[PDB]
């Protein structure tokens, strides 16, 4: 690691600076360096890690979608052959995306998940593991696609089981996990009914627990509840 010579605290400081500068590739590299120091991550540090890679892979995914759409059109009945370039470049972006996902999954496997004992850390990391297998699934087409899907499902399921036992229904990590696992069902697993059921049950159980929250906790929980509702409106 090229961050091996930098202090852990300096890496965290520079990750925050990179965030302010919207330099998310740098932010991700700094937080990878911090993880590789071997210490567990605090709550703030876990979110710096997740924010950085979510932005990096999110940009890759958007680019992949543009290129895949162009590629499909080049393959419709009537299209003028344009050669291998669209496929090649889509493949280039795809390989870079897979590399970022493998990097994140590698950090979770070495050794963030195995040292995560508290619900807030363990659920957070297992949600990330589901998310990055889901992004691999979005581009998968080979002998491995079912196995990638099952890896996402398995990570999400373990996170769900812990979250239901150890967190209140309004916990934003629990809510975001359910939101994303619901999207997994709809978009990856061809299970729209499961997606809708999960979003609705999550929303209703959160609604019933809002009365326990402070104003600031209420704001966070209702924001993600609104995303659940948004998806349900998209799907019904």
């Amino acid at each position: 690691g090229a961050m091996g010579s930098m202090e852990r605290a300096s890496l965290i400081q520079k990750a925050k600076l990179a965030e302010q500068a919207e330099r998310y590739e740098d932010m991700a590299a700094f937080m990878k360096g911090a993880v590789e120091k071997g210490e567990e991550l605090s709550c703030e540090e876990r979110n710096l890690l997740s924010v950085a890679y979510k932005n990096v892979v999110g940009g890759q995914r958007a680019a992949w979608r543009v290129l895949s759409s162009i590629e499909q059109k080049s393959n419709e009945e009537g299209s003028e052959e344009k050669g291998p370039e669209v496929r090649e470049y889509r493949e280039k972006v795809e390989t870079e995306l897979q590399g970022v996902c493998d990097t994140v999954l590698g950090l979770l496997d070495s050794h963030l998940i195995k040292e995560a004992g508290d619900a807030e850390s363990r659920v957070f990391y297992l949600k990330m593991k589901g998310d990055y297998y889901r992004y691999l699934a979005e581009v998968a087409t080979g002998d491995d696609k079912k196995r990638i899907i099952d890896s996402a499902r398995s990570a999400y399921q373990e996170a769900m089981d812990i979250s239901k036992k150890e967190m209140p229904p309004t916990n934003p990590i629990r809510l975001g996990l359910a939101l994303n696992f619901s999207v997994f069902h709809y978009e990856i697993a061809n299970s729209p009914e499961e997606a809708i059921s999960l979003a609705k049950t999550t929303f209703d159980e959160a609604m019933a627990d809002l009365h326990t929250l402070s104003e600031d906790s209420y704001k966070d929980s209702t924001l993600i509840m609104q995303l659940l509702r948004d998806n349900l409106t998209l799907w019904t």
Binding site: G176, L179, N180, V183, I224, L227, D230, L234
Partner: peptide, 5 residues
Amino acid sequence: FPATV
């Protein structure tokens, strides 16, 4: 696309 966080 649907919302994720």
